[PDB]
């Protein structure tokens, strides 16, 4: 019963030329790129039936496209709906699917990908099941299996094709544990791609002259993969060869110092499969990466994932918290106030995205030193990654540093990044007002201080924003937007425009303490220093960190983060809410912020902190730590560890949602990926609770049900909120 | 129903770099040793051993297809002798042992032949592959780390300093050669011969017994470029959390030798020895199998120790002498320190660092070593334990009688 | 101190040649196993297993590095519980239950799982290497001939003709598909799945149930060609130097299936098994290892026979159901015409000619098979018997309780 096939609509159109070689050009009616639905899997069975049938009169196949991508996506709808009971059905549709590019790949002639565009994941295997693939050298066309990316791997083919290509070791590093996207001229020199074209109209009559020249100057070897033929040799060897066997152990030890110990499963199956599948047949290697493509589809992991860095991800791209209605204003320069680490990264990311930006800041020495953090970016992009060009000249004839006020002349975007000082703020804004042009908006990178009382110090407070970007602006993705009292919808539209122009996504956040990237990770770092308090070991406070997901443990992030500006945050919220009436309760934390620095020690600044740090270089833990705080005298499981300090932000984003500082869940969750390091497997802080697996249970009733285990054990701070229904 | 050991030799290890045992077959090894048993009871009837059982850790090669059946066949002994071979790590030979007491005891075999093989010069340690190392998910899921990283790993823990290693490891070659020199080993250590019968080797060879505490401590740590290629450590952190860094204190100098090595003992009953006229040396008191964390992987002999106590019903009072394999120098010292052993008592007479560790054999080895000292010192009850692999241990009380 | 058993399953074989089993990792399969151990007592408290004893006859690859202490570590078991390969060839599975028995009786172990398993599809025959075959001085002297060269020689010592052989390949096709028909394995073969509890193979599918007689008489002596070429006959005919001629009767129809499996079985004491509220199936009455003549090699089945017989102080009268296995219909033949068996007593589910010979899992396999037997026809004994390389012979008689 096990065939090609699984009312849909054909999505591959068939010619046959004189010669005898068949061009399937893959054109999905129902959209505009090209995906691996229900669609495609008819329609390719179809195809490739076609192909065994008129074996005789065909030559050669040739797989183009009629989108402006080759192939890339997939019905994600779909498979985050596979339960565990679903495995059976998944396993089939997978199999059938290489079924079809087995056959495709077995069928004594040449086949050609004239890949025209973007090919990520099944577009890519589609590609590997081809003997031939020849690339359009255009650039925004990329190459890779993202799979990982979705708590998924390539299930397509991908992981028993790129490791009979390029052997276990470099098809796992390189392609598969990262899910690496790769230019046509990069992916021609690692091998995904075999020659390049100027322009995708001789894309096809290159594949088909490439058909011609394969059969004649080849006819024996012609439509034969090199792991098809008799004595094919794996690169760097089988586990079952002496040389990468004496390494094989490494593997998966090196896997876990990469991962931190995160409960992140997709790269351990990508891992297991591409092993074991090199040690077996081709046919038996594909049957073993199915089986465990459907291990992680039903799994939780892949469904926050799905969720985030799809579904969630998309739908912030679509404008969903941007308002509906207005328009599209331009930008014309942009003004950058202080040129420190923030600072000069926000004048890379807005010259790289080719905005023309004056930085401005006290004295010219620090501008140019700001601008200089450009510039040691581009010495790692344009003579030592090759990312860059001779174009990253332009980029820093964008960046035009100064220390005049009077340079900002015709400035429309106004984005400062200085000390966060209210008086100091109302007064650079003061000096600026008047200076810009009156239509101007008024950005204002702050972590902690109010938009609403920060927007006193101009006129024109309908213009005044928050744009919260994270350090180092040049790798971090997210900015978060912070609506003050009086900001217009036009003025957040603007920004919303600038933000996914300089290749970044955008949260919209309302005015409130801590806004809700600052506000989570106070949680965050007050729930270690609390566990220190109470005689934990550091060490295994920062084991619990990182094996959590987090990407800097907890002490650590608390001496990049001035261990003297956490206190400040602490009297400044007891000012406010003691001005407000209300009793102000002290967090178990702020005793050990004190206790640290009235020893001295206060981060990465002053040189001691928990670290210790000798000629500008993170040393050990200090080891004065376990005589201060009696650590070793409190041994908790560190499960429980994980759990406080990930349920600490998840219940404080609830809050969030409550208190209506957050719109929609989707920036919470991408909001503290991309800004908090939440781990991504939980698939952010809101899908945390939804998406959440323990001894009690998986769902929001086993989360409200080890929240009150934690709380009953750890403080009832840790209690559900209302809004889960208890 | 009782077990008694009758007879327990072995030969001179031969170090792995340019040894004198390279050019000698494992299979050599063994029968070689048969023929020396043969030498001293001319007159047993041979077709009343049962069992012929040897341990072997690396069964490849030279080392492969049951090559305990292959020494029965190649020494001319009778063919219902039978032969197996069995791997528990490097506690294979006190394993073998401890099967052939319990197959003695339990009155269906009389009398049995136990040891073990291992040429680490010919077949190199891991030559056989394994799931715990080669295969990911289970690597990845067993948290999988060298024994020489549960050896620093101790170190760390229990605050052993690289002079604390080296001490001990001094200590080991001292005694070592002291055993040497008081010709405590002439007894026992067969000499190997070729077919000619020329001497190819007659001693330990990779003793140093000229090392000095200055020379162990200009000594390189020779782990701690597989910890920080493989990230070794940091695997070994995420199970210890609570551990910071790991101290690699263990080098060339404190670590067990790579050698080549056989031994060999007969155990039978006590009815079996009166018939053929031999002369009971020792009797198995007790045996024990447990184990500890495989990450850490060596703190198996602890668990083991005691559970082979309470079998007995003694405690570490009555033991007159320690026998624990030397393949780290801080597995030794953890293993004093949990028990609180007294130094007169632990190795006596060195063990691998100075002599060698052959995986198979070294259980059987260290066995033998023991049942000599006590007839030696005429003391009475001795205990014998090896780390093990994947955190398993084996424990072993005989008796001089 | 009596040993009992109170479990005894195994998976189905799968085949080599296109077979379910080959993508499933040898390890997979006792992990499968002790999973479902585990779902009929999950009170058990699997600290008190000492250990868990495999066989295996090729430990190399996914087969190396003690297996049983990794299928210990993979499926969760606590830390204590031990773990050893041992390989006394084909009858390593009988081995493992034999010394677990042994375990068991000595009083030193408690609870202890035995079994095997071999994935001949993924480590083929003969990948460990060995002395027997590889080393000449070795083979040379010893004469070393293939365990089918000496099945074609007990053909033609005793007379069995080329019907004869098939005449019982048929026969234990037959009962074998009678067996599987009836749901004789239904309770004791656990059906392999992989990890999303989708199925991979749930029956023996080397069995050919529509065999014929003259479809069997079509075959090819498949050993002609390793005879001829490898010299194999005249070696065989110079130690049994009356015979005149080899008469090849073996093929693929009359000789033992290459197949994947793996078997378990849980062997505890009488005071073990009330302090977990497990009931004994059978008991371990007796064992005996023996041999015979390495160069017919498969003759030790007959003197390890009567050897576990005069230890039990039972005849050929006392038992009810003798299982040897079908390594070659010449075998049984042979150990049939020595004993003088009714053959309603051999074999009376098939054998390995039908559902294949996972050689460290096939006396396992073959041992459980009689202990449902026994339960099913509420017979009293039985004894089981495999013939071994080398000359080798294990004979165990089993009683139920
Ligand atoms: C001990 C171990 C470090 C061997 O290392 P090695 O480099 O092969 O051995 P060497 O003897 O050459 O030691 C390296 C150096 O130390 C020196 N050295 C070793 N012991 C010494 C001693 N006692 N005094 C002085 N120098 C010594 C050597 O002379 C050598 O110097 P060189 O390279 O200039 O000759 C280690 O690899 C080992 O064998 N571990 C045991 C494995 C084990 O226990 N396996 C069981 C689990 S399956
Ligand atoms: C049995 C043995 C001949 C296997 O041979 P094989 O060629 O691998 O197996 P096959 O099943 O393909 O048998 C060959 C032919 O016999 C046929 N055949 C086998 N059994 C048959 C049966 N019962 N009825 C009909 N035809 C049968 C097969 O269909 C095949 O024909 P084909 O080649 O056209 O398909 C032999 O090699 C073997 O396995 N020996 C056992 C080894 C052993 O016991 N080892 C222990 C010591 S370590």
Same mark, same amino acid.
């Given at each position: 019963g096990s065939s090609h096939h699984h009312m849909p609509d054909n999505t591959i159109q068939w010619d046959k030329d004189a010669d005898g070689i068949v061009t399937l050009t893959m054109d999905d009616p129902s959209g505009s790129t090209n995906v691996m639905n229900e669609a495609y899997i008819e329609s390719m069975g179809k195809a490739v039936d076609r192909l065994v049938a008129e074996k005789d009169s065909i030559t050669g196949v040739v797989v183009a496209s009629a989108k402006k991508t080759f192939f890339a996506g997939g019905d994600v709808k779909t498979m985050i709906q596979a339960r565990p009971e679903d495995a059976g059905d998944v396993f089939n549709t997978v199999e059938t699917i290489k079924r079809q590019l087995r056959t495709l790949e077995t069928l004594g002639k040449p086949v050609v990908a004239a890949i025209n565009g973007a090919a990520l994941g099944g577009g890519l295997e589609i590609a590997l099941a081809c003997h031939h693939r020849i690339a359009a050298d255009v650039k925004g066309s990329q190459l890779g299996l993202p799979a990982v990316t979705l708590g998924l791997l390539p299930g397509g083919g991908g992981v028993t094709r790129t490791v009979r290509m390029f052997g276990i070791q470099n098809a796992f590093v390189s392609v598969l544990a990262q899910g690496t996207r790769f230019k046509p001229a990069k992916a021609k020199e690692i091998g995904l791609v075999d020659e390049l074209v100027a322009t995708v109209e001789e894309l096809v009559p290159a594949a088909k002259a490439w058909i011609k020249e394969e059969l004649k100057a080849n006819p024996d070897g012609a439509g034969v993969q090199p792991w098809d033929k008799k004595?094919?040799?794996?690169?760097?060897?089988?586990?079952?060869?002496?040389?990468?066997?004496?390494?094989?152990?490494?593997?998966?030890?090196?896997?876990?110092?990469?991962?931190?110990?995160?409960?992140?499963?997709?790269?351990?199956?990508?891992?297991?499969?591409?092993?074991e599948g090199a040690q077996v047949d081709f046919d038996t290697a594909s049957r073993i990466e199915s089986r465990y493509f459907a291990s992680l589809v039903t799994g939780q992991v892949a469904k926050n994932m799905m969720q985030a860095f799809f579904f969630?991800?998309?739908?912030?791209?679509?404008?969903?918290?941007?308002?509906?209605?207005?328009?599209?204003?331009?930008?014309?320069?942009?003004?950058?106030?202080?040129?420190?680490?923030?600072?000069?990264?926000?004048?890379? +990311?807005?010259?790289?995205?080719?905005?023309? +930006?004056?930085?401005?800041?006290?004295?010219?020495?620090?501008?140019?030193?700001?601008?200089?953090?450009?510039?040691?970016?581009? =010495?790692?992009?344009?003579?030592?990654?090759?990312?860059?060009?001779?174009?990253?000249?332009?980029?820093?004839?964008?960046?035009?540093?100064?220390?005049?006020?009077?340079?900002?002349?015709?400035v429309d975007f106004v984005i400062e990044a200085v000390f966060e000082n209210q008086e100091l703020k109302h007064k650079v804004f003061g000096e600026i007002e008047d200076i810009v042009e009156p239509n101007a908006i008024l950005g204002s990178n702050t972590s902690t201080l109010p938009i609403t009382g920060l927007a006193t110090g101009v006129k024109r407070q309908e213009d005044f924003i928050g744009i919260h970007f994270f350090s180092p602006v040049d790798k971090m993705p997210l900015v978060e937007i912070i609506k003050g009292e009086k900001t217009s919808d036009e003025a957040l539209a603007r920004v919303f425009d600038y933000t996914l122009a300089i290749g970044k996504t955008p949260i919209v956040v309302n005015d409130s303490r801590g806004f809700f990237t600052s506000r989570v990770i106070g949680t965050f770092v007050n729930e270690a220093l609390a566990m220190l308090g109470e005689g934990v070991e550091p060490a295994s406070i920062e084991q619990a960190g990182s094996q959590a997901g987090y990407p800097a443990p907890p002490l650590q992030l608390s001496d990049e983060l001035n261990?003297?500006?956490?206190?400040?945050?602490? +009297?400044?919220?007891?000012?406010?809410?003691?001005?407000?009436?209300?009793?102000?309760?002290?967090?178990?934390?702020? =005793?050990?912020?004190?206790?640290?620095?009235?020893?001295?020690?206060?981060?990465?600044?002053?040189?001691?902190?928990?670290?210790?740090?000798? #000629?500008?270089?993170?040393?050990?833990?200090?080891?004065?730590?376990?005589?201060?705080?009696?650590?070793?005298?409190?041994?908790?499981?560190?499960? #429980?560890?994980? #759990?406080?300090?990930?349920?600490?932000?998840?219940?404080?984003?609830?809050?969030?949602? #409550?208190?209506?500082?957050?719109?929609?869940?989707?920036?919470?969750?991408?909001?503290?990926?991309?800004?908090?390091?939440?781990?991504?497997?939980?698939?952010?802080?809101?899908?945390?609770?939804?998406?959440?697996?323990?001894?009690?249970?998986?769902?929001?009733?086993?989360?409200?049900?080890?929240?009150?285990?934690?709380?009953?054990?750890?403080?009832?701070?840790?209690?559900?909120?209302?809004?889960?229904?208890? | 129903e009782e077990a008694f050991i009758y007879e327990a030799i072995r030969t001179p290890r031969g170090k792995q770099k340019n040894g004198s045992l390279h050019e000698v077959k494992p299979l050599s090894l063994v029968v070689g040793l048969i023929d020396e048993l043969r030498k001293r009871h001319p007159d047993l009837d041979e077709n009343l051993i049962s069992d012929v059982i040897l341990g072997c850790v690396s069964p490849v090669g030279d080392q492969g297809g049951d090559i305990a059946r292959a020494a029965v066949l190649a020494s001319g002994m009778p063919v219902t002798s039978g032969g197996v071979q069995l791997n528990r790590f490097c506690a294979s030979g006190l394993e073998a042992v401890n099967t052939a007491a319990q197959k003695v005891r339990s009155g269906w075999d009389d009398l049995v032949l136990a040891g073990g093989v291992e040429s680490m010069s010919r077949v190199p340690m891991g030559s056989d592959g394994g799931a715990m190392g080669l295969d990911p998910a289970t690597n990845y899921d067993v948290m999988f780390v060298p024994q020489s990283i549960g050896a620093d790993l101790i170190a760390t823990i229990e605050g052993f300093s690289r002079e604390d290693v080296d001490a001990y490891a001094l200590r080991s070659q001292q005694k070592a050669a002291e055993a040497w020199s008081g010709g405590y080993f002439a007894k026992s250590v067969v000499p190997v011969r070729d077919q000619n019968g020329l001497l190819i080797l007659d001693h330990d060879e990779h003793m140093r017994p000229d090392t000095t505490?200055?020379?162990?401590?200009?000594?390189?740590?020779?782990?701690?470029?597989?910890?920080?290629?493989?990230?070794?450590?940091? &695997?070994?952190?995420? *199970?210890?959390?609570?551990?910071? *860094?790991?101290?690699?204190?263990?080098?060339?100098?404190?670590?067990?030798?790579? &050698?080549?090595?056989?031994?060999?003992?007969?155990?039978?009953?006590?009815?079996?020895?009166?018939?053929?006229?031999?002369?009971?040396?020792?009797?198995?008191?007790?045996?024990?199998?447990?184990?500890?964390?495989?990450?850490?992987?060596?703190?198996?002999?602890?668990?083991?120790?005691?559970?082979?106590?309470?079998?007995?019903?003694?405690?570490?009072?009555?033991?007159?002498?320690?026998?624990?394999?030397?393949?780290?120098?801080?597995?030794?010292?953890?293993?004093?320190?949990?028990?609180?052993?007294?130094?007169? *008592?632990?190795?006596?007479?060195?063990?691998?660092?100075?002599?060698?560790?052959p995986l198979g054999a070294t259980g059987a080895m260290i066995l033998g070593t023991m049942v000599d000292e006590l007839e030696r010192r005429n003391a009475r009850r001795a205990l014998i334990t090896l780390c093990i692999g994947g955190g398993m241990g084996v424990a072993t009380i005989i008796e001089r009688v």
């Open positions: 004595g094919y040799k794996m690169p760097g060897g089988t586990p079952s060869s002496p040389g990468l066997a004496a390494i094989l152990p490494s593997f998966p030890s090196n896997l876990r110092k990469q991962l931190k110990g995160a409960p992140m499963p997709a790269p351990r199956a990508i891992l297991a499969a591409a092993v969630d991800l998309q739908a912030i791209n679509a404008g969903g918290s941007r308002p509906e209605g207005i328009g599209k204003t331009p930008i014309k320069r942009i003004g950058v106030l202080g040129a420190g680490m923030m600072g000069a990264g926000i004048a890379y +990311v807005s010259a790289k995205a080719g905005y023309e +930006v004056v930085l401005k800041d006290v004295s010219l020495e620090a501008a140019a030193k700001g601008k200089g953090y450009s510039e040691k970016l581009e =010495a790692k992009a344009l003579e030592r990654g090759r990312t860059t060009q001779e174009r990253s000249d332009a980029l820093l004839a964008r960046i035009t540093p100064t220390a005049d006020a009077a340079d900002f002349k015709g261990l003297e500006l956490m206190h400040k945050i602490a +009297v400044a919220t007891r000012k406010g809410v003691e001005d407000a009436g209300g009793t102000y309760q002290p967090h178990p934390a702020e =005793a050990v912020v004190e206790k640290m620095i009235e020893l001295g020690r206060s981060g990465r600044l002053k040189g001691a902190g928990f670290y210790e740090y000798a #000629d500008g270089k993170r040393s050990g833990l200090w080891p004065g730590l376990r005589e201060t705080f009696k650590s070793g005298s409190s041994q908790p499981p560190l499960q #429980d560890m994980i #759990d406080r300090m990930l349920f600490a932000e998840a219940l404080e984003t609830q809050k969030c949602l #409550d208190e209506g500082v957050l719109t929609s869940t989707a920036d919470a969750n991408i909001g503290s990926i991309m800004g908090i390091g939440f781990p991504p497997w939980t698939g952010g802080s809101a899908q945390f609770i939804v998406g959440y697996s323990g001894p009690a249970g998986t769902g929001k009733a086993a989360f409200v049900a080890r929240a009150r285990e934690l709380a009953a054990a750890y403080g009832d701070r840790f209690l559900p909120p209302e809004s889960l229904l208890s | 505490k200055e020379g162990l401590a200009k000594l390189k740590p020779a782990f701690e470029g597989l910890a920080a290629l493989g990230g070794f450590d940091d &695997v070994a952190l995420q *199970k210890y959390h609570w551990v910071e *860094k790991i101290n690699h204190v263990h080098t060339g100098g404190n670590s067990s030798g790579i &050698v080549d090595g056989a031994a060999l003992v007969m155990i039978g009953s006590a009815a079996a020895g009166k018939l053929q006229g031999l002369t009971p040396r020792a009797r198995i008191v007790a045996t024990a199998t447990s184990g500890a964390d495989p990450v850490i992987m060596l703190t198996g002999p602890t668990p083991a120790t005691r559970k082979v106590l309470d079998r007995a019903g003694l405690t570490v009072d009555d033991i007159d002498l320690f026998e624990l394999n030397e393949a780290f120098a801080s597995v030794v010292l953890k293993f004093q320190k949990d028990l609180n052993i007294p130094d007169e *008592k632990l190795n006596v007479n060195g063990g691998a660092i100075a002599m060698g560790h």
